[PDB]
C-alpha cells in the first residue's frame, strides 16, 4: 500500500516496523479466515510467548510509537516543507500551503476496538500515573479523550506525498482556495456558477488590470502572462510599473509572504529577473531567478564574472 511518496523497505518487506494498525498482531479476517503477519497468526504468537516462559525466558515487545503508515482517509492540512528537525528549508516556497494528506484511520480496525479501552481501569487502580506531570509539556497525560481513529490533529507531519504544492485548487488572482462546504461561504470559478468569467489584461486611464480564468480581478498577487513575463498587482488591483525619473525598485509585501522582497518593475510592468537593474541615482542592483533583489553576497556569471552586492543591495 502506498498513497503517495516513496515506499520504504520496512513496508514492502513486511518486517513489522511499518504498520497501519497498531493492535492487529495477526488476527483473522472478519470472515474467519487466517491472516498471519510475516511471523504468523496471533495464536502462533501467544504460543511462541508461552513456550519461552515454559523455558524460563522473557519475551520483548517492540514498542514503535514514532510513526504509522498508509492511512486510508484524506484530510486537508496546512503544511510547511521541513528537514528532519522540523526546521523550514532555507530556499522553499512551500510554506503554510494547503495539502491533501493521508492521515485518517479507517475507524473500523483494531485501533478502533482497543483504542483507549484500558485507561479507565488503569486510572482507577494507579491514580498517580495520571496525575504525574511530564517534563516536556508541564502537564499530566490525558485519558479524558480516547483515540479510536487517527487523524491529522494527532500528527506532526508526513513524508512528502508527491501531490504538489497546489493540488488543492486555488485562484491565482485573489489567492483564495475554492470551497463548497457551507452554502454561506462558497467560492468557485464563475463559469461553474453560470456567471460570466472575463479573463485577460485590460488598460484603463489609471493603469492595467488583470482577470484570471475564473473571472476574478488580481489584487495583491503576482501574475504570469502567456509569454512568461511576471507582473505584480497592488492592493488596488493595478499593475505596478515604473514612471520616468522615479525609482523602478519597489518593495512588495504580499499575502503570499514567501514572495516578499524588493523587485524591479519596468515601465511596461515586466519584472526583471536574473539580471542587473539601475535605479534613478545610478546605483546598480541584481535581481534573482524569481525577481527578488539580492543583498550581501558575491554572485557569479555564466562567463565567469564575479560581482559583490552590499547589504543595502548596491553593487560594489
Amino acid at each position: 500500500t502506498n498513497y503517495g511518496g516513496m515506499s520504504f523497505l520496512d513496508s514492502f518487506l513486511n518486517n513489522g516496523y511499518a504498520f497501519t494498525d497498531r493492535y492487529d498482531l495477526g488476527f483473522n479476517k472478519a470472515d474467519g479466515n487466517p491472516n498471519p503477519t510475516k511471523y504468523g497468526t496471533d495464536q502462533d504468537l501467544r504460543n511462541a510467548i508461552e513456550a519461552l516462559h515454559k523455558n524460563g525466558m522473557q519475551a520483548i515487545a517492540d514498542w514503535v510509537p514514532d510513526q504509522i503508515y498508509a492511512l486510508p482517509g484524506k484530510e486537508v492540512v496546512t503544511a510547511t516543507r521541513v528537514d528532519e528537525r522540523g526546521n523550514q528549508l532555507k530556499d522553499t516556497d512551500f510554506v503554510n500551503l494547503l495539502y491533501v494528506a493521508n492521515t485518517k484511520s479507517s475507524g473500523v480496525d483494531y485501533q478502533a476496538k482497543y483504542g483507549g479501552e484500558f485507561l479507565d481501569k488503569l486510572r482507577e487502580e494507579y491514580p498517580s500515573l495520571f496525575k504525574q506531570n511530564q517534563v516536556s509539556t508541564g502537564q499530566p497525560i490525558d485519558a479524558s479523550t480516547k483515540i479510536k481513529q487517527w487523524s491529522a490533529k494527532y500528527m506532526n507531519g508526513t513524508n512528502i506525498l508527491h501531490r504538489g504544492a497546489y493540488y488543492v485548487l486555488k485562484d491565482w488572482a485573489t489567492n483564495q482556495y475554492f470551497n463548497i462546504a457551507k452554502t454561506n461561504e462558497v467560492f468557485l470559478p464563475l463559469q461553474l456558477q453560470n456567471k460570466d468569467a472575463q479573463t485577460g489584461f485590460i488598460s484603463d486611464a489609471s493603469g492595467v488590470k488583470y482577470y484570471s480564468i475564473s473571472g476574478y480581478q488580481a489584487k495583491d498577487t503576482f501574475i504570469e502572462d502567456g509569454n512568461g513575463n511576471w507582473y505584480y498587482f497592488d492592493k488596488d488591483g493595478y499593475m505596478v510599473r515604473s514612471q520616468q525619473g522615479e525609482n523602478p525598485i519597489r518593495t512588495v509585501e504580499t499575502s503570499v509572504n514567501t514572495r516578499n522582497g524588493n523587485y524591479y518593475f519596468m515601465p511596461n510592468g515586466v519584472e526583471l529577473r536574473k539580471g542587473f537593474g539601475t535605479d534613478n541615482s545610478g546605483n546598480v542592483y541584481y535581481f534573482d531567478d524569481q525577481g527578488k533583489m539580492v543583498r550581501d553576497k558575491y554572485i557569479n556569471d555564466d562567463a565567469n564574472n564575479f560581482y559583490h552586492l552590499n547589504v543595502d543591495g548596491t553593487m560594489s
Partner: peptide, 9 residues
C-alpha cells in the same frame, strides 16, 4: 522528530 511516514505527535 521526523523519520518515517506519518510522524505521531
Amino acid at each position: 522528530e521526523f523519520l518515517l511516514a506519518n510522524d505521531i505527535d
